[PDB]
PDB file of all heavy atoms in Angstrom:
ATOM      1  N   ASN R  12       0.841  -1.187   0.000  1.00 20.08           N
ATOM      2  CA  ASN R  12       0.000   0.000   0.000  1.00 20.08           C
ATOM      3  C   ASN R  12       0.884   1.247   0.000  1.00 20.08           C
ATOM      4  O   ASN R  12       2.114   1.171   0.057  1.00 20.08           O
ATOM      5  CB  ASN R  12      -0.954  -0.021   1.192  1.00 20.08           C
ATOM      6  CG  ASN R  12      -0.230  -0.135   2.524  1.00 20.08           C
ATOM      7  OD1 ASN R  12       0.861   0.412   2.711  1.00 20.08           O
ATOM      8  ND2 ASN R  12      -0.840  -0.849   3.459  1.00 20.08           N
ATOM      9  N   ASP R  13       0.251   2.418  -0.081  1.00 21.16           N
ATOM     10  CA  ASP R  13       1.019   3.656  -0.178  1.00 21.16           C
ATOM     11  C   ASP R  13       1.843   3.884   1.084  1.00 21.16           C
ATOM     12  O   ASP R  13       3.037   4.195   1.012  1.00 21.16           O
ATOM     13  CB  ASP R  13       0.085   4.838  -0.452  1.00 21.16           C
ATOM     14  CG  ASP R  13      -0.431   4.851  -1.884  1.00 21.16           C
ATOM     15  OD1 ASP R  13       0.353   4.516  -2.798  1.00 21.16           O
ATOM     16  OD2 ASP R  13      -1.616   5.194  -2.095  1.00 21.16           O
ATOM     17  N   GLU R  14       1.225   3.709   2.253  1.00 23.01           N
ATOM     18  CA  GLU R  14       1.948   3.841   3.512  1.00 23.01           C
ATOM     19  C   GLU R  14       3.270   3.080   3.472  1.00 23.01           C
ATOM     20  O   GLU R  14       4.346   3.674   3.604  1.00 23.01           O
ATOM     21  CB  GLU R  14       1.075   3.357   4.672  1.00 23.01           C
ATOM     22  N   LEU R  15       3.211   1.760   3.281  1.00 24.54           N
ATOM     23  CA  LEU R  15       4.443   0.975   3.300  1.00 24.54           C
ATOM     24  C   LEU R  15       5.420   1.422   2.219  1.00 24.54           C
ATOM     25  O   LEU R  15       6.637   1.262   2.378  1.00 24.54           O
ATOM     26  CB  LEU R  15       4.131  -0.515   3.149  1.00 24.54           C
ATOM     27  CG  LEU R  15       3.624  -1.246   4.391  1.00 24.54           C
ATOM     28  CD1 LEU R  15       3.226  -2.672   4.050  1.00 24.54           C
ATOM     29  CD2 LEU R  15       4.686  -1.244   5.475  1.00 24.54           C
ATOM     30  N   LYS R  16       4.914   1.972   1.110  1.00 25.97           N
ATOM     31  CA  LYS R  16       5.805   2.463   0.063  1.00 25.97           C
ATOM     32  C   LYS R  16       6.590   3.681   0.534  1.00 25.97           C
ATOM     33  O   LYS R  16       7.791   3.798   0.263  1.00 25.97           O
ATOM     34  CB  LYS R  16       5.011   2.802  -1.200  1.00 25.97           C
ATOM     35  CG  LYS R  16       4.702   1.614  -2.104  1.00 25.97           C
ATOM     36  CD  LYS R  16       3.935   2.056  -3.352  1.00 25.97           C
ATOM     37  CE  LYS R  16       3.663   0.888  -4.292  1.00 25.97           C
ATOM     38  NZ  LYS R  16       2.946   1.301  -5.533  1.00 25.97           N
ATOM     39  N   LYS R  17       5.925   4.601   1.237  1.00 25.06           N
ATOM     40  CA  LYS R  17       6.604   5.807   1.698  1.00 25.06           C
ATOM     41  C   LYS R  17       7.544   5.510   2.858  1.00 25.06           C
ATOM     42  O   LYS R  17       8.573   6.181   3.004  1.00 25.06           O
ATOM     43  CB  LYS R  17       5.576   6.872   2.093  1.00 25.06           C
ATOM     44  N   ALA R  18       7.227   4.503   3.676  1.00 22.60           N
ATOM     45  CA  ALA R  18       8.088   4.129   4.791  1.00 22.60           C
ATOM     46  C   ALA R  18       9.249   3.234   4.377  1.00 22.60           C
ATOM     47  O   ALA R  18      10.242   3.160   5.109  1.00 22.60           O
ATOM     48  CB  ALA R  18       7.277   3.424   5.879  1.00 22.60           C
ATOM     49  N   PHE R  19       9.153   2.545   3.240  1.00 20.50           N
ATOM     50  CA  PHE R  19      10.212   1.647   2.773  1.00 20.50           C
ATOM     51  C   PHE R  19      10.545   1.943   1.315  1.00 20.50           C
ATOM     52  O   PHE R  19      10.418   1.079   0.443  1.00 20.50           O
ATOM     53  CB  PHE R  19       9.804   0.186   2.964  1.00 20.50           C
ATOM     54  CG  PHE R  19       9.666  -0.218   4.409  1.00 20.50           C
ATOM     55  CD1 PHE R  19       8.469  -0.038   5.083  1.00 20.50           C
ATOM     56  CD2 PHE R  19      10.738  -0.768   5.095  1.00 20.50           C
ATOM     57  CE1 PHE R  19       8.344  -0.400   6.415  1.00 20.50           C
ATOM     58  CE2 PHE R  19      10.619  -1.134   6.424  1.00 20.50           C
ATOM     59  CZ  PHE R  19       9.420  -0.952   7.085  1.00 20.50           C
ATOM     60  N   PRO R  20      11.004   3.164   1.020  1.00 19.38           N
ATOM     61  CA  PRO R  20      11.302   3.523  -0.377  1.00 19.38           C
ATOM     62  C   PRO R  20      12.385   2.671  -1.019  1.00 19.38           C
ATOM     63  O   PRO R  20      12.524   2.714  -2.249  1.00 19.38           O
ATOM     64  CB  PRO R  20      11.740   4.992  -0.281  1.00 19.38           C
ATOM     65  CG  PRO R  20      11.215   5.473   1.044  1.00 19.38           C
ATOM     66  CD  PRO R  20      11.257   4.282   1.945  1.00 19.38           C
ATOM     67  N   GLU R  21      13.153   1.905  -0.237  1.00 16.47           N
ATOM     68  CA  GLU R  21      14.169   1.021  -0.800  1.00 16.47           C
ATOM     69  C   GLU R  21      13.582  -0.237  -1.429  1.00 16.47           C
ATOM     70  O   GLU R  21      14.216  -0.826  -2.311  1.00 16.47           O
ATOM     71  CB  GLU R  21      15.176   0.616   0.278  1.00 16.47           C
ATOM     72  N   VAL R  22      12.395  -0.667  -1.001  1.00 15.44           N
ATOM     73  CA  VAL R  22      11.781  -1.891  -1.515  1.00 15.44           C
ATOM     74  C   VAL R  22      11.113  -1.549  -2.846  1.00 15.44           C
ATOM     75  O   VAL R  22      10.045  -0.936  -2.880  1.00 15.44           O
ATOM     76  CB  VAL R  22      10.788  -2.493  -0.519  1.00 15.44           C
ATOM     77  N   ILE R  23      11.741  -1.953  -3.953  1.00 10.28           N
ATOM     78  CA  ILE R  23      11.232  -1.625  -5.281  1.00 10.28           C
ATOM     79  C   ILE R  23      10.852  -2.894  -6.038  1.00 10.28           C
ATOM     80  O   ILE R  23       9.914  -2.887  -6.844  1.00 10.28           O
ATOM     81  CB  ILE R  23      12.257  -0.800  -6.081  1.00 10.28           C
ATOM     82  N   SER R  24      11.565  -3.989  -5.781  1.00  8.26           N
ATOM     83  CA  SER R  24      11.380  -5.204  -6.568  1.00  8.26           C
ATOM     84  C   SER R  24      10.037  -5.852  -6.254  1.00  8.26           C
ATOM     85  O   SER R  24       9.745  -6.172  -5.097  1.00  8.26           O
ATOM     86  CB  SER R  24      12.515  -6.189  -6.305  1.00  8.26           C
ATOM     87  OG  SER R  24      12.455  -7.275  -7.216  1.00  8.26           O
ATOM     88  N   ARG R  25       9.225  -6.054  -7.292  1.00  7.59           N
ATOM     89  CA  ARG R  25       7.955  -6.753  -7.165  1.00  7.59           C
ATOM     90  C   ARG R  25       7.823  -7.951  -8.090  1.00  7.59           C
ATOM     91  O   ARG R  25       7.017  -8.843  -7.802  1.00  7.59           O
ATOM     92  CB  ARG R  25       6.782  -5.794  -7.436  1.00  7.59           C
ATOM     93  N   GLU R  26       8.588  -8.002  -9.180  1.00  6.25           N
ATOM     94  CA  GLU R  26       8.438  -9.077 -10.152  1.00  6.25           C
ATOM     95  C   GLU R  26       8.936 -10.389  -9.563  1.00  6.25           C
ATOM     96  O   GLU R  26      10.002 -10.440  -8.943  1.00  6.25           O
ATOM     97  CB  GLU R  26       9.198  -8.745 -11.435  1.00  6.25           C
ATOM     98  N   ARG R  27       8.157 -11.446  -9.753  1.00  8.25           N
ATOM     99  CA  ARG R  27       8.464 -12.787  -9.280  1.00  8.25           C
ATOM    100  C   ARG R  27       8.347 -13.763 -10.437  1.00  8.25           C
ATOM    101  O   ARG R  27       7.811 -13.429 -11.498  1.00  8.25           O
ATOM    102  CB  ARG R  27       7.505 -13.200  -8.155  1.00  8.25           C
ATOM    103  CG  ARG R  27       6.164 -13.674  -8.674  1.00  8.25           C
ATOM    104  CD  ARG R  27       5.120 -13.652  -7.592  1.00  8.25           C
ATOM    105  NE  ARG R  27       3.877 -14.287  -8.015  1.00  8.25           N
ATOM    106  CZ  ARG R  27       2.737 -14.201  -7.336  1.00  8.25           C
ATOM    107  NH1 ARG R  27       2.683 -13.490  -6.217  1.00  8.25           N
ATOM    108  NH2 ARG R  27       1.651 -14.815  -7.780  1.00  8.25           N
ATOM    109  N   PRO R  28       8.818 -14.996 -10.257  1.00 10.49           N
ATOM    110  CA  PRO R  28       8.774 -15.967 -11.354  1.00 10.49           C
ATOM    111  C   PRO R  28       7.365 -16.496 -11.563  1.00 10.49           C
ATOM    112  O   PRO R  28       6.643 -16.800 -10.608  1.00 10.49           O
ATOM    113  CB  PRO R  28       9.720 -17.084 -10.885  1.00 10.49           C
ATOM    114  CG  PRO R  28      10.141 -16.719  -9.468  1.00 10.49           C
ATOM    115  CD  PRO R  28       9.243 -15.623  -8.996  1.00 10.49           C
ATOM    116  N   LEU R  29       6.975 -16.597 -12.830  1.00 11.94           N
ATOM    117  CA  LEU R  29       5.665 -17.142 -13.161  1.00 11.94           C
ATOM    118  C   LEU R  29       5.639 -18.646 -12.922  1.00 11.94           C
ATOM    119  O   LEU R  29       6.624 -19.351 -13.158  1.00 11.94           O
ATOM    120  CB  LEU R  29       5.301 -16.831 -14.615  1.00 11.94           C
ATOM    121  CG  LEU R  29       5.132 -15.355 -14.999  1.00 11.94           C
ATOM    122  CD1 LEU R  29       4.732 -15.218 -16.459  1.00 11.94           C
ATOM    123  CD2 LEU R  29       4.123 -14.647 -14.109  1.00 11.94           C
ATOM    124  N   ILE R  30       4.508 -19.128 -12.429  1.00 13.60           N
ATOM    125  CA  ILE R  30       4.294 -20.556 -12.243  1.00 13.60           C
ATOM    126  C   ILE R  30       3.921 -21.176 -13.582  1.00 13.60           C
ATOM    127  O   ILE R  30       3.230 -20.560 -14.399  1.00 13.60           O
ATOM    128  CB  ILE R  30       3.196 -20.802 -11.193  1.00 13.60           C
ATOM    129  CG1 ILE R  30       3.520 -20.054  -9.899  1.00 13.60           C
ATOM    130  CG2 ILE R  30       2.986 -22.306 -10.971  1.00 13.60           C
ATOM    131  CD1 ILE R  30       4.914 -20.346  -9.369  1.00 13.60           C
ATOM    132  N   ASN R  31       4.383 -22.398 -13.819  1.00 13.76           N
ATOM    133  CA  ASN R  31       4.012 -23.109 -15.043  1.00 13.76           C
ATOM    134  C   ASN R  31       3.946 -24.594 -14.693  1.00 13.76           C
ATOM    135  O   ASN R  31       4.954 -25.303 -14.719  1.00 13.76           O
ATOM    136  CB  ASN R  31       4.987 -22.843 -16.175  1.00 13.76           C
ATOM    137  CG  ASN R  31       4.728 -23.723 -17.369  1.00 13.76           C
ATOM    138  OD1 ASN R  31       5.430 -24.711 -17.582  1.00 13.76           O
ATOM    139  ND2 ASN R  31       3.703 -23.382 -18.152  1.00 13.76           N
ATOM    140  N   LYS R  32       2.748 -25.047 -14.357  1.00 15.75           N
ATOM    141  CA  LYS R  32       2.542 -26.417 -13.928  1.00 15.75           C
ATOM    142  C   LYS R  32       1.363 -26.998 -14.685  1.00 15.75           C
ATOM    143  O   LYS R  32       0.493 -26.264 -15.164  1.00 15.75           O
ATOM    144  CB  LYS R  32       2.327 -26.482 -12.414  1.00 15.75           C
ATOM    145  CG  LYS R  32       3.567 -26.042 -11.636  1.00 15.75           C
ATOM    146  CD  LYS R  32       3.320 -26.009 -10.145  1.00 15.75           C
ATOM    147  CE  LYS R  32       3.318 -27.406  -9.561  1.00 15.75           C
ATOM    148  NZ  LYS R  32       2.969 -27.378  -8.116  1.00 15.75           N
ATOM    149  N   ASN R  33       1.381 -28.320 -14.836  1.00 16.13           N
ATOM    150  CA  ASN R  33       0.305 -29.056 -15.481  1.00 16.13           C
ATOM    151  C   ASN R  33      -0.801 -29.349 -14.481  1.00 16.13           C
ATOM    152  O   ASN R  33      -0.576 -29.389 -13.267  1.00 16.13           O
ATOM    153  CB  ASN R  33       0.801 -30.388 -16.048  1.00 16.13           C
ATOM    154  CG  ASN R  33       1.845 -30.221 -17.131  1.00 16.13           C
ATOM    155  OD1 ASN R  33       1.596 -29.598 -18.170  1.00 16.13           O
ATOM    156  ND2 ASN R  33       3.028 -30.788 -16.899  1.00 16.13           N
ATOM    157  N   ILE R  34      -2.003 -29.573 -15.005  1.00 16.37           N
ATOM    158  CA  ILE R  34      -3.077 -30.161 -14.210  1.00 16.37           C
ATOM    159  C   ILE R  34      -2.509 -31.454 -13.636  1.00 16.37           C
ATOM    160  O   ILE R  34      -2.062 -32.319 -14.400  1.00 16.37           O
ATOM    161  CB  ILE R  34      -4.337 -30.405 -15.054  1.00 16.37           C
ATOM    162  CG1 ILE R  34      -4.862 -29.079 -15.602  1.00 16.37           C
ATOM    163  CG2 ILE R  34      -5.423 -31.118 -14.235  1.00 16.37           C
ATOM    164  CD1 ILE R  34      -5.816 -29.243 -16.748  1.00 16.37           C
ATOM    165  N   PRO R  35      -2.460 -31.622 -12.330  1.00 16.33           N
ATOM    166  CA  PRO R  35      -1.823 -32.830 -11.794  1.00 16.33           C
ATOM    167  C   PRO R  35      -2.724 -34.055 -11.823  1.00 16.33           C
ATOM    168  O   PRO R  35      -2.215 -35.178 -11.858  1.00 16.33           O
ATOM    169  CB  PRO R  35      -1.463 -32.424 -10.358  1.00 16.33           C
ATOM    170  CG  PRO R  35      -2.495 -31.418  -9.996  1.00 16.33           C
ATOM    171  CD  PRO R  35      -2.768 -30.644 -11.273  1.00 16.33           C
ATOM    172  N   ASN R  36      -4.045 -33.879 -11.808  1.00 15.21           N
ATOM    173  CA  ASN R  36      -4.942 -35.030 -11.702  1.00 15.21           C
ATOM    174  C   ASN R  36      -6.384 -34.536 -11.648  1.00 15.21           C
ATOM    175  O   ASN R  36      -6.646 -33.339 -11.481  1.00 15.21           O
ATOM    176  CB  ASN R  36      -4.624 -35.890 -10.468  1.00 15.21           C
ATOM    177  CG  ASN R  36      -4.784 -35.122  -9.169  1.00 15.21           C
ATOM    178  OD1 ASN R  36      -5.899 -34.810  -8.759  1.00 15.21           O
ATOM    179  ND2 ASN R  36      -3.667 -34.824  -8.507  1.00 15.21           N
ATOM    180  N   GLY R  37      -7.323 -35.488 -11.772  1.00 17.60           N
ATOM    181  CA  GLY R  37      -8.737 -35.145 -11.797  1.00 17.60           C
ATOM    182  C   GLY R  37      -9.282 -34.621 -10.479  1.00 17.60           C
ATOM    183  O   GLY R  37     -10.200 -33.791 -10.466  1.00 17.60           O
ATOM    184  N   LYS R  38      -8.734 -35.084  -9.355  1.00 16.49           N
ATOM    185  CA  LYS R  38      -9.230 -34.617  -8.064  1.00 16.49           C
ATOM    186  C   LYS R  38      -8.932 -33.134  -7.867  1.00 16.49           C
ATOM    187  O   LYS R  38      -9.769 -32.386  -7.345  1.00 16.49           O
ATOM    188  CB  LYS R  38      -8.636 -35.462  -6.938  1.00 16.49           C
ATOM    189  N   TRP R  39      -7.754 -32.683  -8.304  1.00 20.18           N
ATOM    190  CA  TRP R  39      -7.478 -31.252  -8.288  1.00 20.18           C
ATOM    191  C   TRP R  39      -8.476 -30.495  -9.160  1.00 20.18           C
ATOM    192  O   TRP R  39      -8.994 -29.448  -8.752  1.00 20.18           O
ATOM    193  CB  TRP R  39      -6.037 -30.971  -8.742  1.00 20.18           C
ATOM    194  CG  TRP R  39      -5.754 -29.501  -8.808  1.00 20.18           C
ATOM    195  CD1 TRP R  39      -5.209 -28.719  -7.825  1.00 20.18           C
ATOM    196  CD2 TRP R  39      -6.039 -28.625  -9.908  1.00 20.18           C
ATOM    197  NE1 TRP R  39      -5.133 -27.411  -8.253  1.00 20.18           N
ATOM    198  CE2 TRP R  39      -5.635 -27.328  -9.526  1.00 20.18           C
ATOM    199  CE3 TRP R  39      -6.606 -28.812 -11.177  1.00 20.18           C
ATOM    200  CZ2 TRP R  39      -5.776 -26.218 -10.367  1.00 20.18           C
ATOM    201  CZ3 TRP R  39      -6.738 -27.707 -12.020  1.00 20.18           C
ATOM    202  CH2 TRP R  39      -6.325 -26.426 -11.606  1.00 20.18           C
ATOM    203  N   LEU R  40      -8.773 -31.018 -10.359  1.00 23.61           N
ATOM    204  CA  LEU R  40      -9.701 -30.325 -11.247  1.00 23.61           C
ATOM    205  C   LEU R  40     -11.095 -30.233 -10.633  1.00 23.61           C
ATOM    206  O   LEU R  40     -11.786 -29.221 -10.795  1.00 23.61           O
ATOM    207  CB  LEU R  40      -9.761 -31.022 -12.606  1.00 23.61           C
ATOM    208  CG  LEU R  40     -10.674 -30.356 -13.633  1.00 23.61           C
ATOM    209  CD1 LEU R  40     -10.174 -28.952 -13.930  1.00 23.61           C
ATOM    210  CD2 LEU R  40     -10.753 -31.177 -14.923  1.00 23.61           C
ATOM    211  N   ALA R  41     -11.527 -31.282  -9.931  1.00 20.50           N
ATOM    212  CA  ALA R  41     -12.817 -31.226  -9.256  1.00 20.50           C
ATOM    213  C   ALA R  41     -12.846 -30.111  -8.216  1.00 20.50           C
ATOM    214  O   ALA R  41     -13.842 -29.391  -8.091  1.00 20.50           O
ATOM    215  CB  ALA R  41     -13.130 -32.576  -8.609  1.00 20.50           C
ATOM    216  N   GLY R  42     -11.764 -29.951  -7.457  1.00 19.35           N
ATOM    217  CA  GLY R  42     -11.725 -28.887  -6.470  1.00 19.35           C
ATOM    218  C   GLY R  42     -11.695 -27.522  -7.121  1.00 19.35           C
ATOM    219  O   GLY R  42     -12.422 -26.605  -6.718  1.00 19.35           O
ATOM    220  N   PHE R  43     -10.859 -27.368  -8.145  1.00 24.85           N
ATOM    221  CA  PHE R  43     -10.800 -26.103  -8.866  1.00 24.85           C
ATOM    222  C   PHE R  43     -12.150 -25.771  -9.490  1.00 24.85           C
ATOM    223  O   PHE R  43     -12.627 -24.634  -9.393  1.00 24.85           O
ATOM    224  CB  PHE R  43      -9.696 -26.185  -9.918  1.00 24.85           C
ATOM    225  CG  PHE R  43      -9.416 -24.894 -10.622  1.00 24.85           C
ATOM    226  CD1 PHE R  43      -8.759 -23.860  -9.971  1.00 24.85           C
ATOM    227  CD2 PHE R  43      -9.762 -24.734 -11.953  1.00 24.85           C
ATOM    228  CE1 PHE R  43      -8.472 -22.681 -10.631  1.00 24.85           C
ATOM    229  CE2 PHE R  43      -9.473 -23.551 -12.618  1.00 24.85           C
ATOM    230  CZ  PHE R  43      -8.834 -22.526 -11.954  1.00 24.85           C
ATOM    231  N   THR R  44     -12.800 -26.770 -10.101  1.00 23.78           N
ATOM    232  CA  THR R  44     -14.082 -26.548 -10.765  1.00 23.78           C
ATOM    233  C   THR R  44     -15.170 -26.196  -9.764  1.00 23.78           C
ATOM    234  O   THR R  44     -16.069 -25.396 -10.065  1.00 23.78           O
ATOM    235  CB  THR R  44     -14.492 -27.794 -11.559  1.00 23.78           C
ATOM    236  OG1 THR R  44     -13.537 -28.038 -12.593  1.00 23.78           O
ATOM    237  CG2 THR R  44     -15.876 -27.610 -12.183  1.00 23.78           C
ATOM    238  N   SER R  45     -15.123 -26.802  -8.578  1.00 20.85           N
ATOM    239  CA  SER R  45     -16.118 -26.495  -7.563  1.00 20.85           C
ATOM    240  C   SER R  45     -16.044 -25.045  -7.120  1.00 20.85           C
ATOM    241  O   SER R  45     -17.037 -24.511  -6.612  1.00 20.85           O
ATOM    242  CB  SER R  45     -15.950 -27.431  -6.365  1.00 20.85           C
ATOM    243  OG  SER R  45     -16.272 -28.752  -6.752  1.00 20.85           O
ATOM    244  N   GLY R  46     -14.897 -24.400  -7.301  1.00 22.37           N
ATOM    245  CA  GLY R  46     -14.780 -22.993  -6.995  1.00 22.37           C
ATOM    246  C   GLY R  46     -15.076 -22.097  -8.186  1.00 22.37           C
ATOM    247  O   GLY R  46     -15.977 -21.260  -8.107  1.00 22.37           O
ATOM    248  N   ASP R  47     -14.344 -22.260  -9.293  1.00 21.91           N
ATOM    249  CA  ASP R  47     -14.435 -21.339 -10.427  1.00 21.91           C
ATOM    250  C   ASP R  47     -15.221 -21.891 -11.618  1.00 21.91           C
ATOM    251  O   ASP R  47     -15.317 -21.210 -12.646  1.00 21.91           O
ATOM    252  CB  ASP R  47     -13.027 -20.931 -10.890  1.00 21.91           C
ATOM    253  CG  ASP R  47     -12.334 -19.995  -9.914  1.00 21.91           C
ATOM    254  OD1 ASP R  47     -13.044 -19.333  -9.133  1.00 21.91           O
ATOM    255  OD2 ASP R  47     -11.083 -19.920  -9.930  1.00 21.91           O
ATOM    256  N   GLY R  48     -15.771 -23.111 -11.521  1.00 22.61           N
ATOM    257  CA  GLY R  48     -16.487 -23.705 -12.634  1.00 22.61           C
ATOM    258  C   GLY R  48     -17.980 -23.405 -12.606  1.00 22.61           C
ATOM    259  O   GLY R  48     -18.511 -22.814 -11.666  1.00 22.61           O
ATOM    260  N   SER R  49     -18.659 -23.820 -13.673  1.00 21.25           N
ATOM    261  CA  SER R  49     -20.092 -23.569 -13.804  1.00 21.25           C
ATOM    262  C   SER R  49     -20.715 -24.625 -14.708  1.00 21.25           C
ATOM    263  O   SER R  49     -20.263 -24.826 -15.840  1.00 21.25           O
ATOM    264  CB  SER R  49     -20.342 -22.165 -14.362  1.00 21.25           C
ATOM    265  OG  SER R  49     -21.729 -21.889 -14.442  1.00 21.25           O
ATOM    266  N   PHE R  50     -21.749 -25.293 -14.208  1.00 21.63           N
ATOM    267  CA  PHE R  50     -22.567 -26.219 -14.985  1.00 21.63           C
ATOM    268  C   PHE R  50     -23.957 -25.609 -15.116  1.00 21.63           C
ATOM    269  O   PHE R  50     -24.621 -25.375 -14.101  1.00 21.63           O
ATOM    270  CB  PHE R  50     -22.669 -27.584 -14.291  1.00 21.63           C
ATOM    271  CG  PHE R  50     -21.354 -28.283 -14.084  1.00 21.63           C
ATOM    272  CD1 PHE R  50     -20.644 -28.120 -12.902  1.00 21.63           C
ATOM    273  CD2 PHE R  50     -20.852 -29.149 -15.054  1.00 21.63           C
ATOM    274  CE1 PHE R  50     -19.447 -28.782 -12.697  1.00 21.63           C
ATOM    275  CE2 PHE R  50     -19.651 -29.816 -14.858  1.00 21.63           C
ATOM    276  CZ  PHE R  50     -18.946 -29.637 -13.676  1.00 21.63           C
TER     277      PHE R  50
END
């Protein structure tokens, strides 16, 4: 937030490594679908 930015002007780095993973299995997909899916 702005507060922490003004109090810590040295902290500039925000970029992190992107995740790149496969669907591991059907049980994960069921959980993901139960949240963001729609039938």
Side-chain angles (χ1 to χ4, degrees), residues 12-13 15-16 18-20 24 27-37 39-50:
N12 57 35
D13 286 322
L15 282 174
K16 277 181 178 181
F19 294 87
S24 189
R27 80 198 188 192
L29 296 182
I30 307 307
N31 172 258
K32 295 176 76 185
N33 297 300
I34 299 163
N36 61 71
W39 177 93
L40 182 62
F43 187 73
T44 297
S45 293
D47 288 337
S49 182
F50 300 92

